[PDB]
RRP5 protein homolog
Amino acid sequence: GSSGSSGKNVNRVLSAEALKPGMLLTGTVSSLEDHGYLVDIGVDGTRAFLPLLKAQEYIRQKNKGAKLKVGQYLNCIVEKVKGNGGVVSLSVGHSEVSTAIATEQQSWNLNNLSGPSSG
């Protein structure tokens, strides 16, 4: 009588390649780069980089324009996915309750450094 469309898939793929642009995931800054900022996602092989245009925009509006820190929580959303998991495109869209910390031990470097800045 009437056709039928299969709902969900039998066996989930959840593959680094199966990923789709639009998923909200909370990432943490691993290190500060000259071209952008590295975001921790917890994956082997997959690298996530953030553009200075988006990163600087969030920092300027957040840290009134001030360098970020390590292991710091930063909002990021998948905008594009690479074929061979080469480079991932992240962008600031919104935060989410879901958040996990990535630390094996307690250690931090606190240095009271100052410099030029305009308000």
